[PDB]
Design a protein around this nucleic acid. Structure first.
Ligand SMILES: [Zn+2]
Length: 66
DNA sequence: GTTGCAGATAAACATT
DNA sequence: AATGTTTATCTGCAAC
């Protein structure tokens, strides 16, 4: 349900991937990772209208996992 | 057989 | 300058 999905933590709506918070509050891929690592509400001063982009990270597959 | 969703990695940026 | 930190892009799996 992307339609209407707004980041509960920073209200952004241009997320690369929609994540969910432990409380069930929709969040943008950035808040979900930043929040999980620091578990604190970050000011919207880091929110950017459009999505930032960069040269694509080297192409890599993966490794076998236990 | 195709789409969409969730999650993780590595690189690059900022700081000092 | 190196480390720590951050975020965008990739791949996979499940249900119909
Ligand atoms: Zn957010």
């Amino acid at each position: 349900k992307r339609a209407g999905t707004v980041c509960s933590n920073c209200q952004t709506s241009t997320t690369t991937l929609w994540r969910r918070s432990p409380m069930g509050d929709p969040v943008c891929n950035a808040c979900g990772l930043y929040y999980k690592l620091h578990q604190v509400n970050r000011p919207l001063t880091m929110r950017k209208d459009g999505i930032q982009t960069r040269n694509r990270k080297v192409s890599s597959k993966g490794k076998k996992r236990r």
